[PDB]
């Protein structure tokens with residue numbers, strides 16, 4: 521009753537769902553001119569990142585786990601690691617960009633038009649992707665993330681193994697850039713938005729519960745998917761024998777699933793429902 525035929529089906533289902541949802545979202549945005557909006561360009565960038573992550577990094581990792589060997593060379597292992605880091609950080613930063621856009625829309629409605637236009641959004645997205653690619657491709661391809669202990673060199677020399685060993689400085693300065701700062705920004709933004717919504721409800725009740733569900737769906741999903749992995753990412757370098765490799769791999773694959781839940785969270789507007797109904 522091997523797991524090769526058991527977990528493989530689950531991995532295939534994950535890949536199919538991730539590809540299909542994001543392809544549908546991108547086609548719906550592109551085909552119909554009624555959905556082209558400044559707030560929809562960030563969703564397009566997020567969907568592109570999720571599509572690349574579901575097409576490139578996931579199948580090769582699944583093959584590596586099931587076959588238990590890395591047939592390809594060292595160059596493709598490095599390329600795969602770089603693409604993985606790039607696609608994770610781009611998505612996690614686009615989420616914070618969306619949150620800040622919503623904050624600026626809600627808080628200052630008179631000047632919202634001037635702050636965000638078609639000119640600024642393109643530059644913002646390009647800057648996000650450039651910063652994403654500056655921390656992923658450059659340090660990995662210039663060999664600055666490597667370690668010093670003997671097992672790291674033994675893994676590096678052999679061309680039939682692809683395992684992730686990292687240095688302390690790279691791990692800390694990568695987690696800080698990729699996860700914690702956007703988390704703080706999103707927390708502050710959504711706290712302000714919730715306060716404004718509560719004030720408006722109080723005003724209406726003075727003149728004459730529904731926001732907690734949306735805030736939870738937006739935030740708890742991201743926190744539960746990505747917070748556990750980065751804690752052990754920080755811990756495992758400091759403590760040599762406090763984290764096993766299997767737990768690290770499992771917590772890493774928990775995070776990949778988060779790319780499939782984005783269409784359900786950010787793309788269930790009635791206009792999007794009409795677009796999906798017309799397409800299929």
Ligand SMILES: CN[C@@H]1CCc2c(ccc(O)c2O)[C@H]1O
Pocket residue numbers: 601604605608609684691694695698772
């Ligand atoms: C092999 N998986 C990698 C390992 C380290 C790492 C990831 C994602 C974002 C980062 O900032 C990282 O440092 C993971 O996707």
